[PDB]
Every structure is written in C-alpha cells, then in structure tokens.
Amino acid sequence: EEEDAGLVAEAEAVAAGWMLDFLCLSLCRAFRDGRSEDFRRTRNSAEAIIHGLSSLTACQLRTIYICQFLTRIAAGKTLDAQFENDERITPLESALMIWGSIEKEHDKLHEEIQNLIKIQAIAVCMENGNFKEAEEVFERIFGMPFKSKLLMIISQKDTFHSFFQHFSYNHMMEKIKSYVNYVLSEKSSTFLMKAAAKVVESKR
Amino acid sequence: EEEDAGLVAEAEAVAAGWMLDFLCLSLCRAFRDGRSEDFRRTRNSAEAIIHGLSSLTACQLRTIYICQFLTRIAAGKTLDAQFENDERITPLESALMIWGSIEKEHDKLHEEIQNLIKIQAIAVCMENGNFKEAEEVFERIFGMPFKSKLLMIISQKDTFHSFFQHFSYNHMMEKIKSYVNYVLSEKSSTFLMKAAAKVVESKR
Numbered sequence: 001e002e003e004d005a006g007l008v009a010e011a012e013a014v015a016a017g018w019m020l021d022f023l024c025l026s027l028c029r030a031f032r033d034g035r036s037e038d039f040r041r042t043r044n045s046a047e048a049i050i051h052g053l054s055s056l057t058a059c060q061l062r063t064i065y066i067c068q069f070l071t072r073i074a075a076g077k078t079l080d081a082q083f084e085n086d087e088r089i090t091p092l093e094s095a096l097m098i099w100g101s102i103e104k105e106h107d108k109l110h111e112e113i114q115n116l117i118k119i120q121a122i123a124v125c126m127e128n129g130n131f132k133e134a135e136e137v138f139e140r141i142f143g144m145p146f147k148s149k150l151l152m153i154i155s156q157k158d159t160f161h162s163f164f165q166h167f168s169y170n171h172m173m174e175k176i177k178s179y180v181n182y183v184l185s186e187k188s189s190t191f192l193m194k195a196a197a198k199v200v201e202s203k204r
Numbered sequence: 205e206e207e208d209a210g211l212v213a214e215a216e217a218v219a220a221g222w223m224l225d226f227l228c229l230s231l232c233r234a235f236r237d238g239r240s241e242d243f244r245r246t247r248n249s250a251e252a253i254i255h256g257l258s259s260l261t262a263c264q265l266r267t268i269y270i271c272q273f274l275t276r277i278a279a280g281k282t283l284d285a286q287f288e289n290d291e292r293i294t295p296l297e298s299a300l301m302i303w304g305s306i307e308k309e310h311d312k313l314h315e316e317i318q319n320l321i322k323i324q325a326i327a328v329c330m331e332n333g334n335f336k337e338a339e340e341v342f343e344r345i346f347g348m349p350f351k352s353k354l355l356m357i358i359s360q361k362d363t364f365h366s367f368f369q370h371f372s373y374n375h376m377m378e379k380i381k382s383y384v385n386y387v388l389s390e391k392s393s394t395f396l397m398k399a400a401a402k403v404v405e406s407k408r
C-alpha cells in the first residue's frame with residue numbers, strides 16, 4: 001500500500017523523463033523548420049511537463065537549457081517579453097546567458113553564435129527607436145575593434161546600418177539552426193520517438 | 205524530404221496519444237488519492253498535450269471526457285469557475301453534461317453518481333447564500349418526490365439541511381472515486397506506464 005504508491009511515483013518520473021526528451025526533439029525540429037505555431041504549442045507542453053518533474057539528471061538539465069535558449073531566440077524581437085526577474089534583461093540577453101551556461105564544446109560555431117547574438121541584442125533595440133536601451137544592453141554585454149564600432153553606431157543612432165546586414169538576424173538564425181541540426185540527430189534515438197517511429201514504419 | 209516530414213508528424217501523433225493516456229491515468233490516481241497539487245499540475249500537462257493533437261479516436265475522446273469530468277468535479281465548490289461559453293453553467297452542471305455524454309454503461313453506479321451531482325449542484329449554491337441561483341440551477345437540471353423536496357428546501361432557504369448531509373458532497377466524491385478505481389485498472393496497462401513500470405521493476 002505504502003510501497004505501491006512509491007513504485008507508481010518512480011514509474012511516473014521515468015515516463016516524465018521520456019516525455020521531456022521527446023518534447024525537446026519536437027521543439028528543435030519546429031525551430032529548424034520554422035513551424036512557429038507548432039513551436040508555441042510544443043513549448044507549452046514542455047513547460048507543463050517540466051513543472052511535474054522534481055529530480056533532474058545533468059543531461060535533462062542540458063535538455064531544458066536547450067528548450068529555454070530556443071524559446072528566448074524565437075522571442076528575440078519581442079522586447080516586451082520578460083524572461084528574468086530583472087525586468088531590464090532583454091530576450092537575446094537572456095539567450096546569451098543560457099548559451100554560456102550549457103555544458104557544451106566551445107567550438108568555432110559556439111563563438112560565432114555568441115557574437116551574432118551580442119550584435120543582434122543591440123540591433124533589435126536600435127530598430128525600434130530604443131537608442132538609450134541599446135547603450136544599456138551594450139554596457140551589460142561588453143564590459144575593442146567591434147566594441148568601438150558598435151558604440152559609434154549607437155551614438156550615431158543609425159538603426160539601418162550596413163554592419164547589422166552583414167551580421168544580420170537571419171545569419172544568427174541560420175547559424176543557430178545548424179547547431180539545432182546536431183541536437184536533432186542526437187535526440188532522434190530517444191525512447192518515445194524511437195518506439196513511435198517503429199509503430200509508423202510497421203504500418204507502411 | 206517531403207515524405208520524411210510526413211513520417212515524423214505521424215510518429216509525433218503516435219507519441220502524443222501515448223502521453224494523453226499516461227496523463228489520464230496520472231490524473232485519475234491523483235483524484236483518487238486526494239493529491240490536489242499533483243492533480244492541478246497533471247491537468248496542466250494533459251491540457252497542453254490535447255492542444256497538440258488533431259485526430260482523435262473514439263477511445264481518446266472518452267479519455268478526454270474523463271479528464272474533463274474529474275476537472276469539473278474538483279472545481280465543484282468553486283462557483284467563480286466558468287467551464288462553458290454560457291457563463292451561467294456552474295462546475296457541477298458542466299460535470300453532469302460530460303457524465304451523460306461519455307459512451308459508458310448506465311449501471312446503478314452511473315445513476316447514483318448522476319443524482320448525487322444533481323443534489324450537490326443545488327446544495328453548493330445554497331451553502332454560499334446564492335438562493336436565487338440554486339433555483340436557476342434547479343430549473344436547468346429538473347425539467348416528483350426528490351424534485352419537490354429540493355424545491356421546498358430552496359424556497360425555505362435552509363442551507364444547512366439534513367437532506368444535504370445524507371446525499372453529501374463527501375458521498376458524491378466517494379462514489380466517483382469507486383468509478384475512477386475502474387478507470388485506473390483499465391489504463392494501468394497503457395504503453396508508457398507499462399514500459400516505465402518495467403524499467404522501475406528491473407532496478408529492484
């Protein structure tokens with residue numbers, strides 16, 4: 001009776017871990033494919049599942065950080081979104097924090113993604129007339145050559161600058177999508193997805 | 205490329221169906237055990253998963269009605285909850301609608317549960333001083349012997365009546381819990397729960 005409830009709770013924790021992995025794989029694919037509504041609905045599902053979990057392995061915490069990073073990147077142009085208790089931190093600043101917190105290799109791709117988020121964190125403020133806020137974002141990030149070029153653009157209030165077109169929002173998204181392509185190949189073999197794909201293939 | 209995305213979407217629909225079944229089993233157990241916070245968190249998870257599903261088998265629709273019925277029963281005393289587009293329909297009235305919509309046997313237990321919800325739908329209004337609303341609930345439900353006894357109690361405004369203690373809220377909950385005990389035994393063999401319990405048992 002007391003042992004039965006204990007065995008049930010452990011089984012629920014096992015199933016929840018499988019649901020979290022599947023939902024991360026679904027979120028990464030939606031981000032890659034640009035399926036905006038599917039990403040929104042899948043994020044709602046991962047949030048709910050995460051609140052029903054208590055114990056997290058190091059791998060599950062990395063998986064959660066991935067969902068969080070993609071959620072902030074998708075909301076990168078939504079300056080009204082508050083992802084941290086400090087109301088000043090913009091969505092791309094919150095993404096940059098999670099990017100530097102994941103236990104992952106700091107390869108060339110990692111650094112390019114980091115620098116593209118830094119430039120775009122400022123650019124999105126400028127492209128909305130929020131020039132004072134761009135300087136405040138700049139001070140929190142920077143905490144050069146590029147550093148002084150960026151301060152010069154904020155100071156000149158030239159929102160439509162050629163620098164923000166070379167290191168564009170679309171370039172940041174494409175570099176992030178190439179990274180998500182590695183996460184997708186890694187989680188394609190998780191339990192729920194593997195068992196679901198096997199049921200589908202058996203009906204072909 | 206176009207066929208790959210199609211196979212992925214079908215696998216996601218298969219996994220979602222397994223998540224819906226597991227989450228119904230988790231919700232029924234929480235209701236039975238009286239684990240209020242676990243029920244609230246699990247309901248949040250089933251809602252999110254349901255919004256990510258498009259096709260529903262007849263069995264999945266029955267499963268959803270079960271989650272809905274238990275959700276309204278749990279909110280039975282919360283008269284500020286609006287479960288239908290018509291703002292007048294109280295939570296126990298909304299539960300009675302789903303109870304008469306499930307494709308299930310109309311055994312003795314089914315009818316006892318139906319009649320206990322009818323009496324309590326009125327009683328909860330009286331026990332909050334909402335006497336006019338109790339008469340309005342009574343008219344929508346009824347739409348005797350019991351019928352005239354109930355009208356007499358509403359008319360006398362005797363909120364604390366001996367009738368509402370014999371056919372009490374606790375009796376309605378206990379009868380509903382015995383029914384949930386049958387749903388729990390039926391869904392204990394669903395894919396995700398069976399596979400999770402097997403992982404737990406293998407570590408013992």
Ligand SMILES: CS(=O)(=O)NC1(C(=O)O)CCCCC1
Pocket residue numbers: 043044046047048050051064067068069071072
């Ligand atoms: C806005 S969020 O913080 O990014 N949302 C999650 C949460 O747990 O809050 C974290 C992982 C993605 C979905 C759920």
Ligand SMILES: CS(=O)(=O)NC1(C(=O)O)CCCCC1
Pocket residue numbers: 247248250251252254255268271272273275276
């Ligand atoms: C308030 S509710 O309507 O009862 N919520 C569900 C929904 O889909 O809205 C239905 C099944 C239970 C959880 C999700």
